[model samples]
Target: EAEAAGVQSCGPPPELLNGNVKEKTKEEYGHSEVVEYYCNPRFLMKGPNKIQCVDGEWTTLPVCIVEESTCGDIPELEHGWAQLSSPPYYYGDSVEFNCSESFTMIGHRSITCIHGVWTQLPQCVAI
Candidate 1:
């Protein structure tokens, strides 16, 4: 009679058949994709500085490291007065400027890092 019947019990449930499947267990199986921008000294940084895991992968694009503004990087100014600050200023860093006692301020009194560049370039004029 058993041979004619089609009723048979399985060893385990379908879910448990695929290894030790545990419910509500998190699995870390994704690639780490990240994009970052680095600025040179005296220059500022702007744009998306970092990108992390997204859509099972990192999808952030590259960012250009440009001088934030006209005065972002300390370019050579006319006369003896020039940039006195150091390099590697990150975003939103302020750079102070000073001219010789005999020189006058023509442009901005101070330069600030904005969007990876200086806010404005400053020039010293002869007194």
Candidate 2:
């Protein structure tokens, strides 16, 4: 009689058309196994690529997206924040950032997303 170990199992990770995983391919992966993936050069990743097998299924897998004349994720501003325009921030788009309370800003308050990059981000220094 086969034992009932109740062990969780996971199948192969999904194939990425624009990227690949770091580990060798396999038909089966044990529960809790982690898979790391990355996009090909010059491509943008839309989400976190690291995923873990859990309860016979894998966590959310990121997507490799292409971009041209558009911005990627918004850069993090230390001690400050912004509620910028929605995603797919294309060229000529702009947004304003504000320093947290008691912090002074040291650069431009508004930035533009252009040429696939954002204008220089402002800095927030302690008051």
Candidate 3:
């Protein structure tokens, strides 16, 4: 019940919300699961976080995660052309569309990237 009223619900030290982490690693806070950072023009680090592996050592190494509310690029498809199978696109991640034989992929072919925004943006109509 909230850790015997001690209160602890895995807060902080587990990022990816605007994730700008800076290269770091440690396995067994539940065991490492890094996802480095990248966004260009600033907000670029390479790190990891997953604390509370005390007793066996390591506790609060959570640092380096700049900040950008996370949302770099992925917006340039008019006559249709997209195939960004998730790379630096946070949240749910999904961006795959193809249409240029004459163009025709009106909507919802693939687009899901909530939180950082991007969920319903499909185009390519010229047929």
Candidate 4:
């Protein structure tokens, strides 16, 4: 059992995955058989990304559905508000906490969006 021609099942490079990754393949990439995948933002990894030809039988298919972002989330604060250094609050996004006048913070002062979720937030306690 051996792979088919061109296949080793290779693909011609790949398509563009918006908002995140972007790069080209190697000289052999165009001819070699390769499977790639891309996931939508804030989505869950669903189906196979691709498949390829191997020695005789086909290679295991891949997946890259709108998979879930493992990042954290932002929470509302008491007597204060949260501000993001950036929008879309994706993974690795910066976040800061600010309290109203005469109020002070109770928890973390700053946090970041990790694994698709915002780090723990702080609370503003009245002075």
Candidate 5:
């Protein structure tokens, strides 16, 4: 059977401010096609972060917003220390940790900030 050609397709998806489509290298999109988006460094996304290609058009687009809050002082890790530690950590910023001599560090070595808080921090224990 002859397959139906020329399905209602869409052109390139709209570009996002302070964000970009993930791995999107196509010039055209068929109906029902979807694309994902991610914000650039120091920016935050406040919506669905994705869009769909409908009948020759793209669905509602998401937005990229600036960080509203920042993370405070880094938590104290007994027997461990931070390498790139600094003050007034903003959203999406990261810091690396390392255990002191004779101590072992467990969990992720890096912690990031989201909104006004930091992610689960790593710990250091004596050997």
Candidate 6:
């Protein structure tokens, strides 16, 4: 049996061409039915950045929830303490650390993201 208007019953729909179809009817017609898809903030693509329609809508939509980072959120230490470079650090950004005046760093001078939070907590101490 033949498929209904704008519908495919057997193989696939026009929109599923995915740059593979060479014929203009298959390409142009398929692209015309394309729809815009967006991912929620925080989540990102784990694999392909783009998604295409399989039968009608996208076959898969990969998303990642924004990982929570606590470097900036860590409480300040007393006497000597580590503080975030600034409030609200975004993904892929770095934060710098410094000790209180007269104090010296005992370990690494910087803290970085581990999974989603800062790797090491910073501390500032008086010398």
Per-residue lDDT of 10-105 in model 4, one digit per residue for the tens? Answer: 434444233222234543542225555544444333445554435344344444434334443456677877665455665544578888889999
RMSD after CA superposition, every candidate? 19.0, 10.2, 11.3, 8.8, 4.3, 13.1
Clashing pairs in 5: none
Candidate 3 on 1-127: residue-level lDDT in tens? Answer: 2232332232223444444334454433332222344323223333344334333333544344434454455666777667765567655456776767878888887775555666767788888
Clashes of each: 11, 0, 6, 30, 0, 5
**Candidate 6: misplaced stretches above 4 Å?**
1-74, 78-86, 90-92, 122-126
Give the higher-lDDT candidate: 3 or 6: 3
Q: What lDDT, from 0 to 1, does candidate 2 have?
A: 0.72
- In candidate 2, position 82 carries an lDDT of 85
Using lDDT, give the best candidate's number: 5
Worst 10 residues of 5 by lDDT: 1-10
Worst 10 residues of 2 by lDDT: 1-10
Cα lDDT, all candidates: 0.47, 0.72, 0.51, 0.54, 0.75, 0.43
TM-score of each: 0.35, 0.43, 0.25, 0.39, 0.64, 0.34
Q: Could you arrange the candidates by lDDT from highest to lowest?
A: 5, 2, 4, 3, 1, 6
State which candidate has the highest TM-score. 5
lDDT of 6 by residue, 50-113 (tens): 4444434444434344444433453344434554565565343445566778876666666654
Candidate 1 residue lDDT tens string, 38-121: 434333334354443343344443344544343345544565345566555655456767676778777776666666556666
lDDT of 6: 0.43
lDDT of 5 by residue, 30-87 (tens): 7666788877546788768888777757777778787856788677777777888765
Q: Superpose all Cα atoms of candidate 6 onto the true structure and report the RMSD in Å to 1 decimal.
A: 13.1
At residue 76, candidate 4 shows an lDDT of 68
By lDDT, the better pick of 1 and 5 is 5
Q: Which of 1 and 4 is ahead in lDDT?
A: 4
Residue clash pairs of candidate 3 = 22-46, 22-47, 23-46, 23-47, 24-47, 28-31
